[PDB]
DNA sequence: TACAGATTTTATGTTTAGATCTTTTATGCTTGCTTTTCAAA
DNA sequence: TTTGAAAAGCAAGCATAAAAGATCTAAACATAAAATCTGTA
């Protein structure tokens, strides 16, 4: 579930139900209903853009209301729920995994592996390494390197 | 109002209209085993009628 | 006394009584507290002399 | 973990609370019969108490109605000493509509909302008794054009002392504009908790002149003339008549605690009497013997615990200078309650005296100072010899007596709450019992109680590091590390204990957990929003 | 039932709530949407505003010049080539892409994008590229910012849905529908800063659909500012928009000349049959009249506009205003009505340029009454006395009283003191404010010369100059009386 | 299918409860000088 | 009976907490037309 294409954050539990439902349609407005639906059964939900679950203008404690419910039910006994939440650090207990920004050698590897399907590589390789070195750094965004080579 | 409520109101009026650093110069009436001096009080009275 | 509005706080709505940052004041006139002090025969006017 | 949740429901896995007395040698049927005796006495008390509650609510409704129904002004009623829980019902006027509009201070944030709630209530009630309109005072103007009959509005302002008097004044002046309509009658009811002058100093002088044209004061409090507290105390005395005695110290405790509550006296009196009845029937083994059926179930423990009476002490000392004797003295009635009934009836009927407290009268009759209590009236000088009673002393009265010597009523109903917290924290021997960590328990105090003594001897602003240094000096460095090395199954603890600053680190951890425990309790506060370097003490012992 | 309030003016559109993901039983059941009658677009009011003339109106020689200079591409060729190459490569490879374009007003962004998509539609008409659907969404022409969701889906499917259902439908259409059942869509997002809400969900969704593999979507985003994503957008949206951004610079004066002379190709240095009875001119009693615009007049207009903004609208409006001034001078001397050689030379262009640049503010305070100027003079004196840029109104009252009572030897003050404090009556008592005190205060507030604070105490309420102090003193020095004292 | 009623969805208005920021005013710290009771002679 | 001397009192200046309120927002409360869902028929 991409969480930006959602009306309110508090409907995410309902959004978890509509993925896993054939059947009856229940009203889920809290953690408790989704818990008691998932108690008599495993279930893996990938939540892209976790930052959209934050409630704006509602003080520091009550802003993280839905995320505490999700990450608390994600650890509760005798329920079967794995919750994978990806987010972005520049725009914002569970196990934390960090995707570090790409380096120039990794960008070279990605670029030649993507260009492998073509009959030939139209770039010189010092050009690709220069583009990778000029695009990497504290913001190793692969989109920027793709844009630079496309603009070339 | 009761006996406690009237005296609580009286004490609230005293707290609101007297400065706290003159408190030990008025109500302090217990004797001492350790050496010590109470507050002397106001050296000159103000003319503002608080 | 806080319910009867004879004592007020700085906060008037959503006031928590238990915070140490909450201060207290009397709101009665001098004549009302004089009537109260003379109803229990307390001599409050000595304290302002 | 549900302890990290805000709220959670539990469905747990799965015959009287009365316990076995006489050092665990009571009969089981004595316990059950005590339970039924408490139930019948408690029921006999509360039937009278709820009848009295119904009577006071009905009389107040009748008196308010007689004031409300007895030209171009309000009919104003000031209910002095009102707690705003009185139901007001109106009369059903032929070819007129009568509506009651209730307004709390929460429903009164400004004049607009006050008028809008009043007109919604008026329109809803009128259409309920008989198209949308705008909820303003033109509905009052066009009332007879829609509904065909005239209007009587009774405004009941609850908690005026809590209302904004500017908003109330503007709402009254707004309602004054409705006097220009021939079909409108407006009554105002002001429930006042303190007095009339405190609210006349808060309104405008023009508003006072407006309200003075047709107004009635009516002083109706719970503690008015003792007509209702004496009825509840008489109901209790009729309940415990012929079985139980009231000590004079218990009655003076009732008087002292009733003097400290003004708005809610009768619930406090019922609560105190109920808890004393509970304590007697839970504690005393002779509660079975308050009725003459159970005279055939006395044993050696009963004779052991009835022989230790100071009245029995004086009686056998006078006889010098058992079961049959104990059974023989149940037939007596102790007519002090009947004498108090007769004195109250005489004072209410023959002498036309209603302002008296039966609890004070019973207290003076128990002491033996009924004449000195009656001296306040200067009308019983001719009848003091008729109205006087000598207090008869009854053998074995201590085993049938409601009293407070143990401090049980004081600890249960009106405790010195903060003083108990302070006394426990300073002492802690009277809380923690004396008996792995046995070597450290003899030397080191509990951390909160140890820190509280340094708190007590420190000044009003304490430096937190010097407070820590003093707490570190109070602790022994050898035995603390010995007790932390006594467990060999904790590898990180054994690693930390061999480091030379382990005593300081352990002392700091215990000190900081105690410091934020004190912060949550409210003993200390921090003099910043970002610093943690000086604390202020907020609590002094003995206050 | 009795209602607490009423909503008697609710007008609700007929839009369904069911999204496109539920329209078919499965992904494999979705047909070819290109072969669907209502998909991809496969003017009912234009007869309302017509009437019969019943008159033959006069079109003078300058009228054709003024119609040729209206806003309704010699200088945009590199930007055209870049936008065209990116959109062409994205169309004929079935790729999804974002082309970002920014610029100051009137530099030809919308015109270049529209000509690019016109030439692309001409290319797809002759089967050089696959056929696509062109959609325009202008963020300033939406009532609600979510209505773009309603618009684009209605342009794609023909359905009328509500906005959350429309955006769910668009998400399903771009993400899940296969490419062989779809068509390419080119979306022009004009006035992108108007599509920025508090939560940037619309911007994220529109630029995140372009990062979907199946979408076949090209978004041309037109913005005011080069660094609008860096100023107002999150890092995810700034990453999705891209690093390659196209700047539309303001025009130089040679290009503004090229634009203006492209507007004046068919009538500049040309002859007209003028018909001097009425002045109604016909392009080839009646005279053959040459019409010209001075090349140096276009030079100075283009140079001034190119230095100030580079706006093509501003240059065209300057030349049109010059033609209007020349036409007014022409019709004044003949009385032609509306029913040799005439030249739009340098001075008409200079009068058109300077009429936007001369300030009425000093001219406005020059022609005020004595009491308003006395207010301004006292405010300036208080501002120089206590150094504050904010003065209490009671101080201004006392300063006006002091200036009247100190300069009591001035003849004008002698003549005007009785008017100012008694309205010349000797039946009106002496007043604490001057006559027209509240009038001139409110007048200076409506003009925007003054700012006043919202306090109900009149004496301690403060007043500020909203205009320059140098302009105020230059206005105050023009008066004969106030420059003396 | 098929129509009538029930429920939901989307949409907007009404009122209360609370957060955030800003400006003005109390409050306490620091330091130097002056009054006043007090432990000792 | 005195006597210096330290505890206590007062003022100027300034940094800073707190109060009051201006401005705004979320959420509870409230209504309502169109779409959608049952649900027998
Ligand atoms: N290169 C050009 N050649 C001819 N006319 C031009 C040129 N550029 C602009 N114009 C004229 O100026 C008008 C304004 O151009 P356009 O609408 O494209 O501006 P824009 O850059 O989108 O500005 P804005 O940000 O104000 O929307 C055009 O309608 C056209 O009449
Ligand atoms: Mg444009």
- Tokens of residue D387, six digits: 């109205």
- The rounded Cα D286 to chain-centroid distance in angstroms is 30
CB pairs under 8 A between C and D: 17
Residue B49, SS3 per DSSP:
coil
- The answer to whether the beta carbons of residues D286 and D398 sit under 8 Å apart is no
- The answer to whether the beta carbons of residues D226 and D347 sit under 8 Å apart is no
Is residue D198 within 8 angstroms of chain C, CB to CB?
yes
Angle between helices D229-239 and D336-349 (to 10 degrees): 150
- Tokens of residue C42, six digits: 């307390």
- Residue E312 Cβ contacting ligand 1 at under 6 Å: yes
Q: How far is B1 from chain D (nearest CA, A)?
A: 6
Q: Beta E391-392 vs E462-465: how paired, if at all?
A: antiparallel
Cβ-proximal residues to D127 (8 Å cutoff; 6+ apart), any chain: E2
Annotated binding residue E32: no
Terminal alpha carbon distance of chain C: 27
- The answer to whether the beta carbons of residues E343 and E455 sit under 8 Å apart is no
Q: Beta D534-537 vs D524-526: how paired, if at all?
A: antiparallel
Angle at alpha carbon of residue E472, lines to E471 and E473, rounded to 5°: 95
Best B3, B5, B8, B10 member to test C by mutation, with max C CBs in 10 Å, is B10
CA distance E132 to A146: 25
Positions of E strands within chain A: 43-47, 81-85
- Tokens of residue B18, six digits: 């007297």
CB pairs under 8 A between B and C: 41
Q: If we measure between CA atoms, which residue out of E78, E97, E94, E79 comes closest to residue E242?
A: E97
| D463 membership: H or E segment, kind and range | strand D461-463
E44 touches strand G (CB under 7 A): no
- DSSP letter assigned to residue A47: E
Q: If we measure between CA atoms, which residue out of E32, E19, E21, E42 comes closest to residue E183?
A: E32
Chain E residue with Cα closest to D120: E4
Minimum-distance nucleotide, CA of B41 to C1': G9
CA dihedral in degrees (D500, D503, D508, D511; nearest 10)? Answer: 180
**Which numbered atom of ligand 1 lies nearest the CA of E222?**
22
- Complete DSSP assignment for E222-285: EES-TTHHHHHS-HHHHHHH-S-EEEEPPPPHHHHHHHHHHHTSSSTTEEEE--TTT---EE--
CA distance E105 to E310: 9
- DSSP letter assigned to residue A2: B
B26 touches strand G (CB under 7 A): no
CA distance E195 to E139: 5
How many Å does it take to go from CA D61 to C1' F7? 46
Contacting residues 109-168/E vs strand F (CB within 7 A): 144, 162-165
Plot region of D522 (φ>0 → left; ψ -120 to 50 → alpha; else → beta): left
| Helices assigned H by DSSP within E360-484 | 360-366, 370-385, 393-406, 411-422, 437-446, 469-478
Residue E333, SS3 per DSSP:
helix
Cβ-proximal residues to E289 (8 Å cutoff; 6+ apart), any chain: E61, E271, E272, E274, E281, E340, E341, E342
Q: If we measure between CA atoms, which residue out of E71, E68, E82, E73 comes closest to residue E115?
A: E73
- The answer to whether the beta carbons of residues D97 and D150 sit under 8 Å apart is yes
A57 touches strand G (CB under 7 A): yes
Q: Beta E341-344 vs E288-293: how paired, if at all?
A: parallel
CA dihedral in degrees (A84, A86, A92, A96; nearest 10)? Answer: 60
- The rounded Cα D179 to chain-centroid distance in angstroms is 45
Q: Beta E391-392 vs D96-103: how paired, if at all?
A: unpaired
- Tokens of residue D32, six digits: 């059950």
Which chain C residues are closer than 8 Å to D198 by Cβ?
Answer: 28, 32
How many Å does it take to go from CA B35 to C1' F38? 10
Interface subset of C 1-49, CB within 8 angstroms of D: 3-6, 18, 20, 28-29, 32
- Residue E106 Cβ contacting ligand 1 at under 6 Å: yes
Angle between helices D229-239 and D28-69 (to 10 degrees): 160
Which chain C residues are closer than 8 Å to B7 by Cβ?
Answer: 40, 42
- The answer to whether the beta carbons of residues E383 and E357 sit under 8 Å apart is no
Interface subset of A 117-146, CB within 8 angstroms of E: 141, 143-144
Q: Do chains A and B touch (3 or more CB pairs under 8 A)?
A: no
| E218 membership: H or E segment, kind and range | strand E217-223
> How many Cβ atoms are within 10 Å of C7's Cβ, its own excluded?
17
> How many Cβ atoms are within 10 Å of D30's Cβ, its own excluded?
22
CA distance E422 to D292: 106
How many Å does it take to go from CA E153 to C1' F17? 40
| D536 membership: H or E segment, kind and range | strand D534-537
- The answer to whether the beta carbons of residues B35 and B49 sit under 8 Å apart is no
**Probe ligand 1: pick from E71, E77, E108, max atoms within 8 Å of CB?**
E108
CA distance D237 to D142: 59
- Complete DSSP assignment for D403-456: --SSSHHHHHTS--HHHHHHHHHHH-TTTSPP---HHHHHHSPPHHHHHHHHHH
Rg over alpha carbons for chain D, rounded to the nearest Å, is 34
Phi, psi of E450, deg, nearest 5? -115, 150
In the reported structure, the alpha carbon of residue E190 is separated from the centroid of ligand 2 by a whole-number distance in angstroms of 7
Plot region of C25 (φ>0 → left; ψ -120 to 50 → alpha; else → beta): beta
CA distance E147 to E153: 10
- Residue E41 Cβ contacting ligand 1 at under 6 Å: no
Instruction: Give the resolution to one decimal, in Å.
Output: 2.7
Residue D125, SS3 per DSSP:
helix
- Tokens of residue E52, six digits: 């019969």
CA distance D385 to D365: 14
Q: Do D262 and B4 touch (CB under 8 A)?
A: no
Q: How far is D1 from chain C (nearest CA, A)?
A: 29
Cβ-proximal residues to D397 (8 Å cutoff; 6+ apart), any chain: D245, D311
Which residue is closest, via its CA, to the C1' of F35? B43
- The answer to whether the beta carbons of residues D140 and D121 sit under 8 Å apart is no
């Amino acid at each position: 579930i991409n969480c930006i294409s959602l009306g309110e954050p508090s409907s995410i539990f309902q959004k978890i139900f509509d993925s896993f439902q054939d059947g009856p349609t229940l009203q889920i407005k809290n953690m408790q209903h989704l818990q008691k639906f998932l108690e008599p059964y495993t279930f893996v939900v990938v939540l892209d853009e976790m930052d959209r679950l934050l409630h704006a203008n509602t003080s520091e404690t009550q802003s993280v209301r839905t995320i505490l419910e999700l990450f608390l039910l994600a650890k509760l006994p005798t329920v079967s729920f794995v919750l994978i939440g990806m987010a972005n650090s520049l725009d914002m207990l569970p196990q934390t995994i960090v995707f570090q920004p790409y380096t120039a050698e990794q960008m070279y590897e990605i670029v030649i592996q993507k260009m492998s399907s073509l009959p030939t590589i139209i770039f010189q390789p010092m050009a690709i390494k220069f583009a990778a070195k000029k695009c990497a750094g504290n913001t190793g965004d692969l989109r920027k390197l793709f844009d630079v080579l496309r603009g070339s | 109002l009761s006996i406690i409520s009237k005296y609580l109101l009286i004490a609230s009026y005293i707290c609101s209209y007297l400065e706290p650093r003159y408190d030990a110069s008025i109500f302090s009436r217990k004797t001492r085993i350790i050496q010590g001096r109470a507050a002397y009080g106001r050296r000159k009275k103000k003319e503002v009628n608080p | 006394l806080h319910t009867l509005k004879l004592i007020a706080t700085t906060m008037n709505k959503n006031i928590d009584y238990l915070s140490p940052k909450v201060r207290w004041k009397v709101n009665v006139p001098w004549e009302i507290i004089k009537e109260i002090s003379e109803s229990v025969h307390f001599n409050i006017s000595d304290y302002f002399s | 973990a549900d302890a990290q949740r805000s709220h959670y429901t539990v469905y747990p896995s799965l015959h009287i609370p009365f316990v076995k007395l006489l050092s665990g040698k009571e009969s089981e049927v004595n316990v059950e019969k005590r339970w039924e005796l408490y139930h019948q006495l408690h029921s006999h008390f509360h039937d009278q108490v709820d009848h009295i509650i119904d009577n006071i609510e009905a009389d107040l409704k009748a008196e308010i109605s007689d004031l409300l129904y007895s030209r171009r002004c309000f009919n104003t009623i000031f209910l002095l000493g009102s707690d705003s829980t009185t139901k007001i019902e109106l009369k059903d006027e032929s070819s007129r509509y009568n509506v009651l509009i209730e307004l709390t201070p929460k429903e009164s944030p400004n004049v607009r909302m006050m008028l809008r709630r009043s007109m919604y209530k008026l329109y809803s009630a009128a259409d309920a008794e008989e198209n949308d309109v705008s909820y303003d005072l033109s509905l009052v103007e066009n009332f007879k054009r829609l509904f065909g009959k005239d209007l009587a509005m009774v405004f009941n302002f609850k908690d005026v002392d809590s209302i904004n008097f500017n908003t109330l004044d503007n709402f009254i002046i707004l309602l004054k504009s409705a006097f220009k309509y021939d079909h409108v009658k407006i009554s105002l009811i002001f429930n006042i908790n303190t007095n009339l002058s405190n609210i006349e100093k808060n309104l405008r002088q023009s508003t006072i002149r407006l309200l003075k044209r047709n107004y009635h004061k009516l002083d109706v409090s719970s503690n008015k003339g003792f007509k209702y507290g004496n009825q509840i105390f008489q109901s209790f005395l009729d309940t415990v008549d012929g079985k139980l005695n009231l000590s004079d110290r218990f009655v003076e405790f009732i008087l002292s605690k009733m003097a400290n509550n003004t708005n809610h006296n009768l619930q406090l009196l019922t609560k105190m009497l109920d808890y004393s009845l509970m304590s007697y029937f839970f504690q005393n083994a002779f509660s079975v013997f308050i009725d003459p059926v159970n005279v055939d179930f006395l044993n050696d423990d009963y004779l052991k615990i009835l022989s230790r009476c100071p009245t029995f002490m004086f009686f056998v000392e006078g006889l010098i200078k058992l079961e049959e004797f104990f059974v023989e003295f149940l037939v007596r009635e102790n007519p002090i309650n009947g004498h108090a009934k007769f004195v109250a009836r005489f004072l209410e009927e023959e002498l036309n005296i209603t302002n008296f407290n039966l609890i004070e009268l019973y207290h003076n009759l128990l002491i033996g100072k009924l004449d000195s209590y009656l001296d306040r009236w200067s009308a019983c000088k001719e009848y003091k010899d008729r109205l006087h009673f000598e207090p008869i002393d009854t053998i074995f009265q201590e085993l049938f007596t409601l009293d407070n010597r143990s401090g049980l009523l004081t600890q249960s109903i009106f405790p010195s709450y903060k003083s108990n917290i302070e006394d426990n924290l300073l002492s802690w021997e009277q809380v923690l019992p004396s008996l792995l960590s046995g070597d450290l328990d003899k030397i080191m105090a509990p951390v909160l109680g140890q820190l509280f003594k340094l708190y007590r001897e420190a000044n009003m602003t304490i430096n937190i590091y010097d407070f820590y240094i003093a707490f570190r000096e109070t602790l022994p460095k050898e035995e603390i590390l010995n007790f932390i090395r006594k467990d060999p199954s904790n590898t990180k603890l054994l690693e930390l204990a061999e480091t030379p600053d382990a005593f300081d680190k352990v002392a700091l951890i215990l000190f900081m957990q105690a410091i934020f425990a004190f912060e949550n309790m409210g003993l200390i506060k921090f003099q910043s929003t970002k610093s943690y370097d000086l604390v202020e003490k907020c609590v002094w012992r003995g206050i | 039932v009795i209602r607490k309030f009423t909503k008697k003016n609710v007008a609700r559109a007929k839009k369904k709530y069911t999204p496109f993901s539920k329209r078919f039983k499965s992904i494999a059941a979705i047909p070819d949407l290109t072969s669907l009658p209502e998909f991809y677009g496969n003017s009912r009011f234009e007869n309302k505003l017509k009437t019969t003339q019943k008159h033959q109106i006069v079109e003078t020689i300058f009228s054709k010049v003024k119609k040729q200079l209206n806003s309704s591409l010699p200088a945009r060729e590199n930007e055209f080539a870049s936008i065209y190459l990116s959109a062409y490569s994205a169309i004929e490879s079935d790729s999804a892409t974002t082309i970002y374009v920014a610029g100051t007003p009137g530099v030809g962004k919308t015109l270049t994008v529209r000509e690019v998509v016109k030439e692309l539609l001409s290319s797809s008409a002759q089967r050089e590229i696959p056929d696509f659907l062109y959609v325009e969404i202008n963020g300033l022409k939406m009532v609600k910012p979510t209505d773009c969701y309603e618009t684009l889906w209605n342009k794609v499917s023909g359905e009328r849905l509500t906005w959350a259902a429309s955006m769910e439908s668009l998400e399903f259409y771009f993400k899940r529908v296969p490419k062989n059942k779809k068509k390419t869509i080119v979306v022009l997002l004009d006035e992108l800063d108007a599509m920025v809400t508090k939560s940037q969900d619309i911007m994220y969704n529109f630029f995140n659909w372009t990062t979907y593999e199946n979408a076949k979507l090209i978004v041309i985003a037109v913005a005011n500012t080069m660094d609008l994503p860096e100023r107002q957008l999150g890092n995810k949206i700034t990453s999705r928009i891209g690093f390659t951004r196209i700047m539309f610079t303001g025009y130089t004066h040679e290009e503004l000349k090229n634009i203006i002379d492209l507007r004046l190709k068919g009538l500049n240095d040309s002859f007209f049959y003028v018909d001097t009875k009425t002045g109604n001119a016909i392009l080839i009693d009646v005279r053959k009249v040459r019409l010209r615009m001075s090349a140096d007049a276009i030079e100075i207009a283009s140079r001034k506009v190119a230095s100030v903004s580079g706006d093509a609208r501003r240059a065209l409006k300057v030349c049109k205003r010059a033609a209007e001034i020349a036409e007014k001078h022409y019709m004044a001397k003949h009385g032609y009505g509306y029913d040799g050689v005439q030249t739009v030379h340098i001075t008409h262009v200079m009068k058109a340029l300077n009429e936007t640049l001369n300030s009425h503010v000093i001219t406005f305070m020059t022609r005020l009454s004595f009491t308003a100027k006395l207010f301004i003079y006292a405010l300036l004196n208080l501002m120089k006395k206590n150094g504050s840029q904010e003065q209490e109104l009671g101080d201004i009252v006392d300063e006006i009283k002091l200036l009247i009572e100190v300069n009591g030897s001035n003849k004008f003050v002698m003549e005007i003191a009785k008017t100012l404090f008694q309205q010349g009556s000797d039946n009106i008592s002496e007043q604490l404010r001057i006559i027209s005190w509240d009038f001139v205060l409110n007048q200076l507030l409506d003009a925007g010369i003054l700012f006043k604070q919202t306090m109900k105490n009149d004496r301690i309420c403060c007043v500020k100059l909203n205009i320059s102090v140098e302009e105020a003193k230059r206005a105050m020095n023009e008066d004969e009386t106030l420059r003396n004292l």
